[PDB]
Structure formats: C-alpha cells, structure tokens
Amino acid sequence: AMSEAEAKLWQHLRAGRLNGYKFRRQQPMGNYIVDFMCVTPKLIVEADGVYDHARTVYLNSLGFTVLRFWNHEILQQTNDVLAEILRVLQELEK
Ligand SMILES: [Cl-]
C-alpha cells in the first residue's frame, strides 16, 4: 500500500489542501511510478526510507522538479516539510 510516511503526507496534499495545488499519488511516468505529482507547476515529491540517478535525470528531462524527504522529516517535522513543498511550488510558479 502506501508507507506510513506517504499516507501521512497524502492527507495534506490530497484534495487541493495545500494552498489549492493539485497533487496525485502513485503516478506512472515512463519506467517509473512517482509518490506524489503536481502538474501545475511541475513538481514531484517523494518520501525516502542505492540512488537511481537515471530516474532523476529522466524526470528532470520531462520538466519536473523533484523534492525528496526522509521519512523521519515527514513523520516528525511535517509542518516544516509542508512549508518547504509550498515554498518550492510558489517559486516554480513565479
Ligand atoms: Cl519508480
């Protein structure tokens, strides 16, 4: 299913809850499935428990910024994580 950290983060990102930005979860993109993805602006957010460099390169080639958080940040520093997601969204729009 979704990890504990992923489920905790989806409550905040679903249904346009983070300032109206629309995220979807577990979205296929080429060879990959990304945890959370907003199309406008183009942002992928992932939760991290070998780094796949080619994957990041591919997602960046499609125009997506990728933000990756440790599970412990999502679980114990959720407000700060949300603040950083929002900041990046707004930066990417501006
Ligand atoms: Cl993947």
CA neighbor of 39 nearest in space, from 17, 65, 2: 65
Compute the distance between CA of residue 37 and CA of residue 33 in angstroms, rounded to an integer. Answer: 10
Helices (H), the chain: 4-13, 53-61, 71-76, 78-93
Q: Around 26, how many Cα atoms within 13 Å sit in the side-chain half-sphere?
A: 6
Query: According to the entry, how was the structure determined?
Result: X-ray
The alpha carbon of 33 and the centre of ligand 1 are apart by a number of angstroms equal to 4
CA neighbor of 74 nearest in space, from 84, 89, 59: 84
In the chain, domain spans:
1-94
The alpha carbon of 49 and the centre of ligand 1 are apart by a number of angstroms equal to 14
CA neighbor of 84 nearest in space, from 68, 72, 64: 68
The alpha carbon of 29 and the centre of ligand 1 are apart by a number of angstroms equal to 8
The alpha carbon of 32 and the centre of ligand 1 are apart by a number of angstroms equal to 4
* Residues with Cβ within 8 Å of residue 55, at least 6 apart in sequence: 31, 32
Q: DSSP 3-state assignment of 53?
A: helix
